[PDB]
């Protein structure tokens, strides 16, 4: 699966950082979910293995990483 900037995807939380949560979308696709981009869910309540529905903000090939945004449209 490939990821486009602005499309809707579900991902799984790998680890909780003090500045966000790293989430995998696909075998070679991982990104970062930041707290100010979160609506109903806070980093403080997220656990390793939780499936979170997010929208892709920026997909940067040069960086191989993606920004995630939390939406009430789950």
Every domain of the chain and the residues it spans: 1-74
Q: How far is CA 66 from the centre of its chain?
A: 8
What kind of experiment solved this structure?
NMR
Residues 6+ apart with CB under 8 A from 58: 5, 66, 67
CB atoms within 10 A of CB 3: 15
Q: 19: which 2 tokens?
A: 């500045």
Q: For residue 48, with 0-12 CB atoms within 10 Å meaning exposed, 13-18 middle and 19 or more buried, which class applies? A: exposed
Q: What is the CATH number of domain 1-74?
A: 2.40.50.140
């Amino acid at each position: 699966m490939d990821v486009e900037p602005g499309k809707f995807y579900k991902g799984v939380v790998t680890r909780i950082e003090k500045y966000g949560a790293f989430i995998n979308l696909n075998e070679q696709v991982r990104g970062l979910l930041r707290p100010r981009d979160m609506i109903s869910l806070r980093l403080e309540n997220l656990n390793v293995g939780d499936e979170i529905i997010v929208q892709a903000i920026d997909v940067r090939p040069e960086k191989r990483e993606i920004d995630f945004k939390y939406i009430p449209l789950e």
